[PDB]
Design a protein around this ligand. Structure first.
Ligand SMILES: CC(=O)N[C@@H]1[C@@H](O)[C@@H](F)[C@@](OP(=O)(O)OC[C@H]2O[C@@H](n3ccc(N)nc3=O)[C@H](O)[C@@H]2O)(C(=O)O)O[C@H]1[C@H](O)[C@H](O)CO
Length: 245
């Protein structure tokens, strides 16, 4: 099966739906649910969240599901088993606090050469990949062979400036384009998989070849009265979780 991997950049709103593969799974990340339309449908194979806001995103995801705004088979925390990158207790107890979820590193680490490539450049040169790229590695580890990229623009497809998210991550007021491209090329080259770019106005199309024009239709379903901010747990919830925070 093929996979569409979506970051949340402007390009997400500029998909050339003519080039959509026949049959595919969808990977989403972080604040994908801020999208004002279902640019890639309601059904996710996997949603990926950063360790630092995992508690709050998992809580928000449960409401998205409850409220029939999205579905997802897998729930991934994009960790790396590095003390300077994420809380060691959170990781240690993860499956007991989030039993239907997965540590992304369980899959990421199956790519030995890429794990090594990433670890070296991060710890040595402070080269971090974005989640778009992390999702790619995990996809390859699950045996996907064709990856179609959207929403990756090297710095959203929506107003991210929402009260709760601003409270949790005040930086919504590390990375580079090159670091991401070099990682993608490395993955393509080393693991013999195919990258495609679904967004021809994206700066990404300079680097990855355009997915092929089939004559695909896609219905972009509208959203109303939808969850467009992350939800915050109660202070008693944080109390209980606190060893892991
Ligand atoms: C403030 C802060 O912490 N920003 C980071 C950001 O530097 C980046 F690390 C990332 O990406 P995030 O912004 O959510 O966007 C999701 C992914 O979509 C692609 N994208 C999006 C917008 C854009 N203009 N150009 C892009 O390329 C990138 O592949 C990105 O990783 C991430 O984990 O990769 O996550 C956010 C937050 O940690 C997260 O949103 C909190 O839940």
């Amino acid at each position: 099966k093929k996979v569409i991997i979506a970051g949340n950049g402007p390009s997400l709103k500029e998909i050339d739906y003519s080039r959509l593969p026949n049959d595919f799974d969808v990977f989403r990340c972080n604040q994908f649910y801020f999208e004002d339309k279902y640019y890639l449908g309601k059904k996710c194979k996997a949603v990926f969240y950063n360790p630092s806001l995992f508690f709050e995103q998992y809580y928000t995801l449960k409401h998205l599901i409850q409220n029939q705004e999205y579905e997802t088979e897998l729930i991934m925390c994009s960790n790396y088993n590095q003390a300077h990158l994420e809380n060691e207790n959170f990781v240690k107890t993860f499956y007991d606090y989030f039993p239907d979820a997965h540590l992304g590193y369980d899959f990421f680490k199956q790519l030995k050469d890429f794990n090594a490539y990433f670890k070296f450049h991060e710890i040595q040169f402070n080269q971090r990949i974005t989640s778009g790229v992390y999702m790619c590695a995990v996809a390859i580890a699950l045996g996907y062979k064709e990856i179609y990229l959207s929403g990756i623009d090297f710095y959203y497809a929506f107003d991210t400036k929402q009260k709760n998210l601003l409270k949790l991550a005040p930086n919504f007021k590390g990375h580079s384009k090159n670091t991401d491209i070099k990682a993608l090329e490395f993955l393509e080259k080393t693991y013999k998989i195919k990258l495609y770019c679904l967004c021809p106005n994206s700066l990404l199309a300079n680097f990855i070849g355009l997915a092929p024009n089939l004559n695909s239709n896609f219905i972009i379903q509208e959203k109303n009265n939808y969850t467009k901010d992350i939800l915050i747990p109660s202070s008693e919830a944080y109390g209980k979780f606190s060893k892991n925070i």
